[PDB]
TrEMBL record:
It is found in: Nucleus. The lineage of its organism: Eukaryota, Fungi, Dikarya, Ascomycota, Saccharomycotina. Coiled coil: none annotated. Component of the RNA polymerase II (Pol II) complex consisting of 12 subunits. It comes from the Eukaryota. The chain holds residues 1081 to 1129 of 1227 of the full protein. Belongs to the RNA polymerase beta chain family. This is DNA-directed RNA polymerase subunit beta. DNA-dependent RNA polymerase catalyzes the transcription of DNA into RNA using the four ribonucleoside triphosphates as substrates. Transmembrane segments: none annotated.
Length: 49
DNA sequence: GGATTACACCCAAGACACCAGGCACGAGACAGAAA
């Protein structure tokens, strides 16, 4: 490489936010009883606002 | 006095008519009583 590279060990930490705990998709599913709109929440297979 | 103060998303945790008191149906036990 034409440019030299800064290089060495550094202390890194893994945070709790992982993509597989955030990915969510919905085509159709449960709806609220009062308004008949998609429910809220990824855990409940909800929709996006 | 009244009304309103960004958007979206995640998760977890604790509460949601309880109750008590007066009225009914059925039953059964221990004591009455003739023999």
């Amino acid at each position: 490489l034409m440019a030299q590279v800064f290089f060495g060990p550094t202390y890194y930490q893994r945070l709790r936010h992982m993509v597989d705990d955030k990915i969510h998709a919905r085509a159709r599913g449960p709806v609220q009883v009062l308004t008949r709109q998609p429910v809220e929440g990824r855990s409940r297979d909800g929709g996006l606002r």
